[PDB]
Every structure is written in C-alpha cells, then in structure tokens.
Amino acid sequence: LNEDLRLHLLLNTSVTCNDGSPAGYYLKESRGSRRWLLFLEGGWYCFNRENCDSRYDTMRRLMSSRDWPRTRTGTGILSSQPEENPYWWNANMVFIPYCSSDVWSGASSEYAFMGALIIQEVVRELLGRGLSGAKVLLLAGSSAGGTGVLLNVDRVAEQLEKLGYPAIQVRGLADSGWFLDNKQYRHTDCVDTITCAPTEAIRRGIRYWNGVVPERCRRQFQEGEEWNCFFGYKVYPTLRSPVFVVQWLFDEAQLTVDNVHLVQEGLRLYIQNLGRELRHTLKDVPASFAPACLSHEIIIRSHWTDVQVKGTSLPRALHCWDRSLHCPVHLVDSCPWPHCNPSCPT
Ligand SMILES: O=C(O)C1=C[C@H](O)[C@@H](OS(=O)(=O)O)[C@H](O[C@H]2[C@H](O)[C@@H](NS(=O)(=O)O)[C@@H](O)O[C@@H]2COS(=O)(=O)O)O1
Ligand SMILES: *[C@@H]1O[C@H](CO)[C@@H](O)[C@H](O)[C@H]1NC(C)=O
C-alpha cells in the first residue's frame, strides 16, 4: 500500500541508537504539499546503567533498530485519511523512532546517547528529499518526544538558517511533554525510572546522557543547572520558534513520577492542586490545548479528532493556530477535577 511511511536507516552509521545499531526515520512524501510534519516518538528514558540494562531487556525496541519494520502506517496527525486528519492529511509525513532514551538531548558519540544528533541527521537527509522547498516544518512529538520538541525546535531552526534555507518556517507541537518539577505526593528514593522525582531524574540524566539544552534557556540558569531547561514552563518563555502545547491537565506520567498510584482526601487535594499549577503555567501560552482529563499522549492516536475544549477540536485548534501565523485561543479547561470534560478519552 502506497500510503505507508517507509523506513530509512541513517547513511551516517556513526549516529546510532543506544546499542550502536543505526538510527533512522520513516517517510512518506506528498507531492501536492509544502507542509512537513516531523514527529518525535516518546517512551520514558533511562538515567543510569542499571536502569538502562533493565530497559534493554524489557523494552529493547526503544534502544535498538534491529527489529524495526520497513513500513509503518501513519496515525492521528500522521494519518493520510481525511476523516482521521481533517486539515493535514495531505502533508509530508515523518516519524522518527525513539531509540536514544535521553529525551532527545544526547549530543556526543557502554550505551550511546545521540538523540539531538539523530534529529540533526534526519533534517540533513530530508533536505535532499524535498524539505528544502517546504513552507512549514512542524517538529511534533509525544511524551518524551514532546519534551524533545522543546529541547530541539530552536536548534532545528538555526540548523536550517545555517545551511542556507531561511524561508522554511520551523514551528513546534509538544504533546504530553510539559511537566512540573514539583514535590512528590509521597517521597520515594530515586531508584526505579518511573517513580523517580522529576527534578532528580533529569539532574541525573543530563549528566549520564551528556545532554544539551536550548541555548536561550541554558544562559538563563547557572552553569550546572541546565536540568531546569527540561521543564516546559522554564524553557517556553525564551523560545524563538512558535510552539503549540497540548497537555492533559492531569497527565498520567506526571502522576507517576509524583509517586501517585491509582482516593483519600489528601490525594484528592494533591491531584486537584496539580491541575491548578499546570493551568497557572499555561496562563500566558495562547497556543495551548489543555483538557481536564487523566490521560497521556494524544496526537498520533486515531481518536485525537474527538477531544474538544470550548467546542473546538484539537485538529481545528491546530489549523486555527497555523492560519494565525500565515476561531479561539488558550483552550484550557476551566472545570477543576479529572475527567470533568465529556470528551475525555476512555
Ligand atoms: O501525489 C503524490 O504524492 C504522488 C503522485 C505521483 O503519481 C507519484 O509519482 S510517480 O508516479 O511519477 O512516481 C508520486 O511518487 C513519489 C513517491 O510517492 C515517493 N515515495 S516516498 O519517498 O516513500 O514518499 C517518492 O519516490 O517520490 C515520488 C515522486 O514524487 S514527486 O517528487 O512529487 O514527483 O506520488
Ligand atoms: C557522522 O556522525 C558522527 C557522529 O555524530 C560525526 O562525528 C561525523 O562527523 C558525521 N559525519 C559527517 C557529518 O559527515
């Protein structure tokens, strides 16, 4: 079937997944479009050797390209089906698998952590396949990929300028990558990946990965405090590129790193207060879609068309935003408990 995205393993074999196998990207071109959607996959991270070894046994797909299929079907925002992707179905579609376990921050050649270099390489190869004629490059991503967008969107804009392609408009779409460096509901020592407090996880990770953060955010904090720049509300104010933020107010990954296990009155208040704090961080982000749901990720799920805030679908909010850069803003739920929005996914 001609709508499948096809796998290209990177020609520069020194840019690799964790285990040294080549990184790569899936692509399907669309002749009648100047719009490029480049999606960064997510799936947590690993911040020390012991935890990376465990991940390599249990989730090898996220550390290696050995078994990646030669094709994949685009879903959600990467779908070519009009009913599934009403405005952008005809776009040039790219899926970049996540095999670096570094929130796309690794910038140096044990395990290799090369996420930032993988993005740089994919952009380089795409230029020869038609990216050089693009009007819009939307760097999109879910979960660790959504954080990856915040970390890389301005680096891609600068890359394209440097290479001599200044007319391409680089923009970002961060889905489920806007986290709070908050106090846990119940303290736990940083041992396992999924329950390690967000502040400590990144403090450890950035050193282990030799990770890099955006230049504009790095200069705001003291040398050694670059971990700050992994948190959306800290990185966002200094971005040069336009970025649309999609974020469930009660994100399941946030609740997990906060050591919440799912209700007593103390936990109800903790969870309610999370939604409030998140809402506060989005107060001055007009390009936002933030429903009051307990969920995680949305933009490559087939049902992304069905979620609404203030009578507006997510595809429509994105179309409205695109058009405003060439129908409403700050689509953040006012209702204050998880799943108060009738369109929340099951
Ligand atoms: O509408 C299209 O996307 C499209 C229309 C053409 O019928 C077809 O060209 S061809 O019949 O002359 O080959 C065009 O082919 C693309 C092909 O889909 C691409 N495959 S991909 O890399 O997996 O996306 C690629 O091979 O480029 C072909 C040429 O496209 S062009 O550069 O726009 O002419 O698809
Ligand atoms: C290939 O990738 C490696 C690792 O990032 C880099 O050192 C090397 O210079 C790259 N080759 C190029 C850009 O030709």
HEC readout, 152-192: HHHHHHHHHHHHCCCCCEEEEEEECCCCCCCCCCCCCCCCC
**Which stretches within the chain are classed as H helix?**
49-58, 115-127, 144-163, 198-209, 215-218, 232-235, 252-257, 265-281, 314-325
Q: Return d(Cα 270, Cα 189) in angstroms, integer.
A: 19
Classify residue 54 by burial, with Cβ atoms within 10 Å: 0-12, 13-18, 19+.
middle
Measured from the Cβ of residue 147, the count of other Cβ atoms closer than 10 Å reads: 27
Measured in Å, residue 108 CA sits from the centre of ligand 2 at 10
Q: Which of 307, 189, 188, 180 is nearest to 255 (CA)?
A: 180
Q: Return d(Cα 141, Cα 164) in angstroms, integer.
A: 25
Header resolution in angstroms: 1.7
- Contact 56/63 with Cβ under 8 angstroms? yes
Q: Return d(Cα 328, Cα 325) in angstroms, integer.
A: 14
Nearest CA to ligand 1 atom 14: 31
143 is catalytic: yes
CA neighbours within 13 Å on the CB side: how many for 7? 13
Catalytic residue among 64, 79, 296, 322: 296
Domain tally for the chain?
A: 1
* Residue 180, domain extent: 1-346
> What is the experimental method?
X-ray
CA-CA-CA-CA dihedral for 319, 322, 323, 324, to nearest 10: 120
187 is catalytic: no
CA neighbours within 13 Å on the CB side: how many for 214? 28
53 is catalytic: no
